[PDB]
Amino acid sequence: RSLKKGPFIDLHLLKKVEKAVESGDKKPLRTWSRRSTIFPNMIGLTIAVHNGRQHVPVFVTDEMVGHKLGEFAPTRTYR
Amino acid sequence: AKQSMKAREVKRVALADKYFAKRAELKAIISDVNASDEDRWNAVLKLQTLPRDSSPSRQRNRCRQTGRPHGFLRKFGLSRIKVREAAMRGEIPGLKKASW
Amino acid sequence: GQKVHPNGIRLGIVKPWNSTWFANTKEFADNLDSDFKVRQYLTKELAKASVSRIVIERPAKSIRVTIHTARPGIVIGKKGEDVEKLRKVVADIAGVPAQINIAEVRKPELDAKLVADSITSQLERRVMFRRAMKRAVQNAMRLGAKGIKVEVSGRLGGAEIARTEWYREGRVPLHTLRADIDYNTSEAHTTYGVIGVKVWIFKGEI
Amino acid sequence: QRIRIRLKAFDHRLIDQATAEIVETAKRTGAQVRGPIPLPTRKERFTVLISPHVNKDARDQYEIRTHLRLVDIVEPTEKTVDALMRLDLAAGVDVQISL
Amino acid sequence: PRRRVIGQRKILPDPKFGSELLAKFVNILMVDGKKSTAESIVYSALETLAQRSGKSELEAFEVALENVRVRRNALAMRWIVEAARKRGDKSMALRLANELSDAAENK
Amino acid sequence: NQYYGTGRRKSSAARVFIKPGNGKIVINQRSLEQYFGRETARMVVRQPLELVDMVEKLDLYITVKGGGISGQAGAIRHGITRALMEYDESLRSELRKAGFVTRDARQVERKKVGLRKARRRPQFSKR
RNA sequence: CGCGAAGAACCUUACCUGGUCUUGACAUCCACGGAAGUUUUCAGAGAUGAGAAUGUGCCUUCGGGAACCGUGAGACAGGUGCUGCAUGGCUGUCGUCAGCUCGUGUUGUGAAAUGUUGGGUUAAGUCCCGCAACGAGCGCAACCCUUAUCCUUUGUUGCCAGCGGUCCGGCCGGGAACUCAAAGGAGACUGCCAGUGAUAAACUGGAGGAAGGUGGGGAUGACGUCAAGUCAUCAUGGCCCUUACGACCAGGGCUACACACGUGCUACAAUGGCGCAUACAAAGAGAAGCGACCUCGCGAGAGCAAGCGGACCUCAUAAAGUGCGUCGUAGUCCGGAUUGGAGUCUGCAACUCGACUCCAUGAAGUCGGAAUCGCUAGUAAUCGUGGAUCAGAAUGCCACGGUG
Ligand SMILES: [Mg+2]
Ligand SMILES: [Mg+2]
Ligand SMILES: [Mg+2]
Ligand SMILES: [Mg+2]
Ligand SMILES: [Mg+2]
Ligand SMILES: [Mg+2]
Ligand SMILES: [Mg+2]
Ligand SMILES: [Mg+2]
Ligand SMILES: [Mg+2]
């Protein structure tokens, strides 16, 4: 989909990764970046992905690298 | 449209010539340069900290007289109904009802 | 039935345009929006000066505005003072320097806008719509009109149900393309809604 | 050298009046002009809605006709240049000079 | 048709044979305005009818026309073309040639 | 001596240049068989030269722009008939009888507002 | 019911959640403080809470005015909230159906009738007779635009017959003939002939003519009917909210999914599929734009880089068709859905929800019930092209030609 010249990630979420590596794992991190590409430095962390009204925590797995955080949060409730 | 909605459109254009006219124009070129900085240009990351409302994709071409976002024409800068009211009173030069 | 606009359908055949300035693709959008600002300003500032028609033409690096009015003395003022205050602000709007030209309307009862504006003013003054229609017709026919009709619509006299009524004297052909038909529209904004005024004036053929 | 004047306007009966004033002046002062040529009219066509709501089928059919005239002057005579450059022409005619 | 009583158009005839009746035959088989592909099928079908199914090509079509009989000629040509489409052979030139062979022997 | 006749169609335009004596046909610096791909288009220009007999009797130098298969072929057929009226001037009685001098002025009908085509209306519901 | 919306990834957007603001996002009036602006800086999803650098234009009977920022007080601003059963304007519809009325005279106690009941003839209340009606007006028609023939004027960026020049390109001298380009004009008016018809209007037939019986097409839609549609284009009476029905920002929704209906595209194929070779359009668009040539990639494209505000240059090689070869009547070399993998481009940003390319997969479907629609000629059918909207996003819509 996206062009190969640079995988996109937001600047605020990239700062949240850097403090999480140095200071160790924390409580699940609330964010709104559903468009960020998952990098290998995020494996192990729990990122709370906003889906319209709440934040759903997502435990990052090794094979999640390359996907988006929006691909793990359903935005509507179906019955 | 509403007065607050037209105030949003003036706010986007005033930032469009401010930020993304010359600064984002350079950042679009350096990310596109194949010759130098093939790996670590980082112009995309500096574009992220810029404000969003300078974008030409976010602005909406609207009628200058009423503010309708539908039926725009770049020839007139107006909405489709307000083109008629200036045409029937002869306010637009050369514009007339045609037959072919 | 629905009527086509008779003045717009005759533009270029028997009726000249009210704007004749030429421009290419570059500056046509900016100057047309500049025309709406100057026509609104001259209407608001000279509403009591009986202004009916504004001709806007643009030479290469200038603009001159021809104001057709039936009372030039308000527009001229004491030795051109009212003209001088208008010529300085049109050039601010248009950007290019401007000039104000004044063309006298000889008979206001033959121009369709001033007939419509007079009925607009009288309906606010509690003049009856039977009387207001009858005065504008008889004054036009005695000054050399070959035919005139006027139509009013919507809440005549403050009634609840909107009504339509039109009176005609002379001969007014709407489907003849040679017919010199002067048409404009004015709205009577009263305390009980909006009253639309339509004026058709036949000035001969070809 | 060669100077040419591109004449373009909306009205066909108004563009040829200003065209005739230039060519007759040029023939009077002794210039060499190969007449005016009629270039093809780039006429735009506009179709917009007349209704603000449903009944889509009723529309208006507009046009904008842009006429074109070109006058070619061979010799740059000083009497030819000084006369034609500050003529009093119609306001609805735009001039384009190539010196 | 209630008031407007007018005639019917007279098209130009066949450029190959000079036949007025064969010009109306190619228009029935013609679909999507494809004249160039319609007349090539009709010419190849009649040449199969002429060389291997009896001489006098202009008369051989007429014998096939006579058994299935302005409007009498129109309905006759339409029944040949529409029945030729629903056959088992390979091409349209082969199917219509066998229909004119069957119409010549009235079966 | 040149004999000229103008023929045209919907969007075609053809010139005809007559020179006395050959059976040569040069269309757009090409041959008759080379340019016309359709055999029907080859014969419709031969139709005005049917009552008037040509075998090896006159040159025709023709060019055409615009149109298509039969639009160019209809333009040439109109153009030849005016050249023969220019050539002999007594041939008109046979040419009025054929009907080839009549310019087919059936142009395309304009695409109308509210309809997808000139007469084709979008599909209609009863109620 | 491909309607408003000519185009919802953000914006649009009026909705929801959440975070925020209260003379307010925005306008007018006064005072004070800062010239405005420029450049950057740290937290926040952002709205913004705090710093560095810089100018000080303009006249200053030195009060400073004036732009814009900042603060503060109130007058006021703001609402796509209510009502198209309070309204204007505009539109659909019957219907481009031929009707709808006045003035005078006349008839009847009268509301009214006649005209405008009848005899013909026309697209037509079109026209002519008849007639206590005679006339006129609104409609129809005509005048307008475009196209179909010819002439005049004018030959560049357009044109190439007679000529010279060949590197075979109107390309270069030239030619002004012709095509084309557009300013004006001629030409069709039942004008002429014959027959029918009450000697009328009109019809039929024929000649002339490019065009003949309103030539072809458009514009042009009467009085009225449906309290038809529009308070969300706008205008506007009244009512309502106001530290909120307002305003800012982030994300989501407008694109959901057990179903129903209307409107379209592509198909079910040999009048075809595919491969190669190859011929012919018209009409538009283009400067924060169209973007050639060259080079690279299977390709979407990318790099390099002219020309062009344009009859010059670019989009731009029109497609059907034609010629050959192939498949041989089948769920197929039909048809392309769906899905996976790998990518291009647009844009802060393509997960929800974009376009396109490449590989692979190959649903249903083998001509469709009752029912129902379009169309009388360059029409139907079909083939492609272009434009508006648009950063990007057309099976919709608007135009344009090809075949017919
Ligand atoms: Mg408003
Ligand atoms: Mg947008
Ligand atoms: Mg939105
Ligand atoms: Mg009449
Ligand atoms: Mg008419
Ligand atoms: Mg209503
Ligand atoms: Mg209603
Ligand atoms: Mg297939
Ligand atoms: Mg019909």
Curated annotation (Swiss-Prot), chain A:
InterPro entries: Ribosomal_uS19, Ribosomal_uS19_bac-type, Ribosomal_uS19_CS, Ribosomal_uS19_SF. GO terms for cellular component: cytoplasm; cytosol; cytosolic small ribosomal subunit. PROSITE patterns: RIBOSOMAL_S19. Keywords: Ribonucleoprotein, Ribosomal protein, RNA-binding, rRNA-binding, tRNA-binding. GO terms for biological process: cytoplasmic translation; ribosomal small subunit assembly. It comes from the Bacteria. GO terms for molecular function: rRNA binding; structural constituent of ribosome; tRNA binding. In the E.coli 70S ribosome in the initiation state it has been modeled to contact the 23S rRNA of the 50S subunit forming part of bridge B1a; this bridge is broken in the model with bound EF-G. The 23S rRNA contact site in bridge B1a is modeled to differ in different ribosomal states, contacting alternately S13 or S19. In the 3.5 angstroms resolved ribosome structures the contacts between L5, S13 and S19 bridge B1b are different, confirming the dynamic nature of this interaction. Bridge B1a is not visible in the crystallized ribosomes due to 23S rRNA disorder. Belongs to the universal ribosomal protein uS19 family. NCBIfam families: rpsS_bact (TIGR01050). Part of the 30S ribosomal subunit. Binds S13 and L5 and cross-links to the A site tRNA. This is Small ribosomal subunit protein uS19. It comes from Escherichia coli (strain K12). The lineage of its organism: Bacteria, Pseudomonadati, Pseudomonadota, Gammaproteobacteria, Enterobacterales. The gene is rpsS.
From Swiss-Prot, chain B:
It holds the Pfam family Ribosomal_S14. One of its GO terms (biological process) is cytoplasmic translation. SUPFAM superfamilies: Glucocorticoid receptor-like (DNA-binding domain). PROSITE patterns: RIBOSOMAL_S14 (PS00527). Binds 16S rRNA, required for the assembly of 30S particles and may also be responsible for determining the conformation of the 16S rRNA at the A site. PANTHER family: 30S RIBOSOMAL PROTEIN S14, SMALL RIBOSOMAL SUBUNIT PROTEIN US14M. Part of the 30S ribosomal subunit. Contacts proteins S3 and S10. Belongs to the universal ribosomal protein uS14 family. This is Small ribosomal subunit protein uS14.
From Swiss-Prot, chain D:
The keyword Transcription applies. GO terms for biological process: cytoplasmic translation; regulation of DNA-templated transcription elongation; ribosome biogenesis; transcription antitermination. It comes from the Bacteria. The keyword Glycoprotein does not apply. GO terms for cellular component: cytoplasm; cytosol; cytosolic small ribosomal subunit; small ribosomal subunit; transcription elongation factor complex. Keywords: Ribonucleoprotein, Ribosomal protein, Ribosome biogenesis, RNA-binding, Transcription, Transcription antitermination, Transcription regulation. Pfam families: Ribosomal_S10 (PF00338). One of its GO terms (molecular function) is transcription antitermination factor activity, RNA binding. Involved in the binding of tRNA to the ribosomes. Part of the processive rRNA transcription and antitermination complex (rrnTAC). The complex forms an RNA-chaperone ring around the RNA exit tunnel of RNA polymerase (RNAP). It supports rapid transcription and antitermination of rRNA operons, cotranscriptional rRNA folding, and annealing of distal rRNA regions to allow correct ribosome biogenesis. In complex with NusB is involved in the regulation of ribosomal RNA (rRNA) biosynthesis by transcriptional antitermination. PANTHER family: 30S RIBOSOMAL PROTEIN S10 FAMILY MEMBER (PTHR11700). Belongs to the universal ribosomal protein uS10 family. This is Small ribosomal subunit protein uS10. It comes from Escherichia coli (strain K12).
From Swiss-Prot, chain F:
One of its GO terms (biological process) is cytoplasmic translation. Keywords: Ribonucleoprotein, Ribosomal protein, RNA-binding, tRNA-binding. Pfam families: Ribosomal_S9 (PF00380). The keyword Transcription does not apply. GO terms for cellular component: cytoplasm; cytosol; cytosolic small ribosomal subunit. The keyword tRNA-binding applies. InterPro entries: Ribosomal_Su5_D2-typ_SF, Ribosomal_uS9, Ribosomal_uS9_bac/plastid, Ribosomal_uS9_CS, Ribsml_uS5_D2-typ_fold_subgr. GO terms for molecular function: RNA binding; structural constituent of ribosome; tRNA binding. NCBIfam families: PRK00132.1 (NF001099). The C-terminal tail plays a role in the affinity of the 30S P site for different tRNAs. Mutations that decrease this affinity are suppressed in the 70S ribosome. Belongs to the universal ribosomal protein uS9 family. Part of the 30S ribosomal subunit. Contacts 16S rRNA. Cross-links to the P site tRNA and weakly to the A site tRNA. This is Small ribosomal subunit protein uS9. It comes from Escherichia coli (strain K12). The lineage of its organism: Bacteria, Pseudomonadati, Pseudomonadota, Gammaproteobacteria, Enterobacterales.
